[PDB]
Design a protein around this ligand. Structure first.
Ligand SMILES: N[C@@H](Cc1c[nH]c2ccccc12)C(=O)O
Lengths: 236, 271
């Protein structure tokens, strides 16, 4: 309910995408006393995102990759079509990557955005009153909290955009199993899974040989509809 | 009783759709003790593990800032409960690990909020890891050592509830019992020291607030640590006094196993 950004509300082509969404609480005591210090805020957030986005993106894709590859290969083992698999993998990977990205970056973003502001504020004002430094620390903590969702979203979307093509590359061999089989006039079916499903799995929940039924794809559609951190999609 | 099995199949099918999933989660988690082959049916059916992962990830926005409600927690913990069965089963354990599913639980282990919804979240997530190491498989320990599980457990051993402290200390114990685990934890003074410092704090706590099950695991951890020569040297010089005097004499008289372990520990430190 509390998500305030949709996936398209934020342009991640450059750090300029962050600028229109920065929120500056006017009641902040450091801002009442020094209204000019509001200028320092934009660069502080851009710097924080700039320094964290690539390692967060790399780490999130790496974690999600293995999990998504294993589960998708498992679910689609009796599916000779590549298309259903590729789409489902696309949606699952983008979703779990977005989730890992959110978990990975939010606390570091808080620490980084605060630090950058405390430094900017201390730099702009060479004076260091014990009361003013309390205002500076307070302002920096507040601003960080108020802008973390925006920054996080920027990094998540960066991660999601890169995740898709990485998943395609990972599933190359799976796409090649099915391509190679079709050009031999046969449908691909994982022999181990084929045997297991036929012998061990109760009919009601058994994987079907060939395509998967549309109703069963519901979980994969939800990955597409509902991405963590974003408003869901609408029609010694 | 055939009607029973068909209810189970139906609930499993009803996990894929978010419309029917919550109720299916509830019902399945209740019957996981009466259905021996529940785990492979969950693993090998279409989309099922994907749905359980979905339940986990969709909780992530409620972690930070910490806003998790009792309702949200109860629901994901039903999903977590099903993953515990999958983690425990000899037919699904290896595949569960290969899919790195535990990694999507670690964000929960990292939370520090002390509200009931979060404590239950952490405890249920620990329970999945607990189920993994109870199988005594080397592949499990090697996987855990590749991950940040140990500092996650140590934080919980320090600040968690009695229950969470117990499961986390048990996980640590299983890791230590493994030869690779012991060598890893004793590889550097910093690693060993951090572990020893937490156990020491726990021992102090235990002298004020008794817990037989937690003390047992703490003692076993120390005992295993003394198998390592460098750890043995360090423990000669920094073992908690409460483990050497009669502080725990009363609570231990009923606990013959822990008693023998403590006596074995003291004996090791002399040599
Ligand atoms: N990377 C950290 C993780 C860690 C913290 N405390 C530990 C105690 C034991 C083993 C590992 C750890 C380290 O090896 O220092």
């Amino acid at each position: 309910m509390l998500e305030q950004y949709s996936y398209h509300d934020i342009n991640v082509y450059s750090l300029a995408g962050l600028a229109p969404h920065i929120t500056l609480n006017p009641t902040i005591p450091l801002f009442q006393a020094h209204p000019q210090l509001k200028q320092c805020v934009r660069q502080a957030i851009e710097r924080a995102v700039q320094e964290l986005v690539h390692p967060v993106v790399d780490r999130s894709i790496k974690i999600a990759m293995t999990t998504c590859e294993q589960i998708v290969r498992k679910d689609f083992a009796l599916d000779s079509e590549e298309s259903r698999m590729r789409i489902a993998a696309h949606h699952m990977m983008r979703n779990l990557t977005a989730g890992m990205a959110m978990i990975t970056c939010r606390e570091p973003l808080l620490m980084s955005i605060s630090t950058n502001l405390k430094n900017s504020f201390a730099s702009a004002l060479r004076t260091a009153s014990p009361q003013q430094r309390e205002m500076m620390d307070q302002a920096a903590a507040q601003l960080a909290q108020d802008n973390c969702e925006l920054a996080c979203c920027f990094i998540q979307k960066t991660a999601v955009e890169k995740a898709g093509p990485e998943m395609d590359k990972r599933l190359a061999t799976e796409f090649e199993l099915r391509k190679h089989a079709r050009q031999e006039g046969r449908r691909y079916c994982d022999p181990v899974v084929l045997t297991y499903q036929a012998e061990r799995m109760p009919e009601q929940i058994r994987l079907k040989v060939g395509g998967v039924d549309p109703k069963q794809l519901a979980v994969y559609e939800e990955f597409a509809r509902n991405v963590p951190g974003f408003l869901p999609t609408n029609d010694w | 009783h055939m009607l029973e099995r068909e209810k189970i199949y139906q609930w499993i099918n009803e996990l894929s759709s978010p419309e029917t999933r919550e109720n299916a989660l509830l019902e399945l988690s209740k019957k996981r003790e009466s259905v021996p082959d529940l785990a492979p049916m969950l693993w090998h059916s279409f989309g099922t593990i994907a749905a359980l992962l979905q339940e986990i990830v969709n909780i992530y926005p409620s972690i930070n800032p910490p806003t998790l409600t009792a309702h949200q927690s109860n629901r994901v913990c039903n999903a977590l409960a099903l993953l515990q069965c999958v983690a425990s089963h000899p037919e699904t354990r290896s595949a569960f690990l290969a899919a790195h599913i535990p990694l999507f639980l670690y964000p929960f282990l990292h939370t520090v909020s002390k509200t009931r919804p979060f404590e239950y979240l952490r405890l249920t997530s620990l329970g999945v890891i607990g189920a993994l190491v109870k199988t005594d498989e080397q592949e499990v320990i090697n996987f855990l050592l590749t991950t940040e599980i140990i500092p996650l457990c140590l934080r919980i051993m320090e600040s968690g509830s009695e229950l969470s402290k117990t499961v986390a200390t048990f996980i640590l114990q299983k890791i230590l019992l493994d030869d690779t685990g012991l060598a890893y934890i004793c590889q550097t003074y910093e690693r060993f020291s951090h572990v020893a410092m937490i156990l020491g704090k726990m021992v102090l706590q235990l002298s004020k607030e008794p817990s037989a099950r937690l003390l047992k695991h703490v003692v076993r951890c120390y005992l295993r640590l003394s198998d390592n020569p460098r750890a043995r040297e360090a423990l000669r010089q920094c073992l908690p006094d409460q483990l050497k005097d009669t502080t725990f004499a009363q609570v231990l008289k009923d606990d013959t196993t822990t008693k023998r372990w403590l006596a074995q520990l003291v004996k090791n430190l002399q040599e």
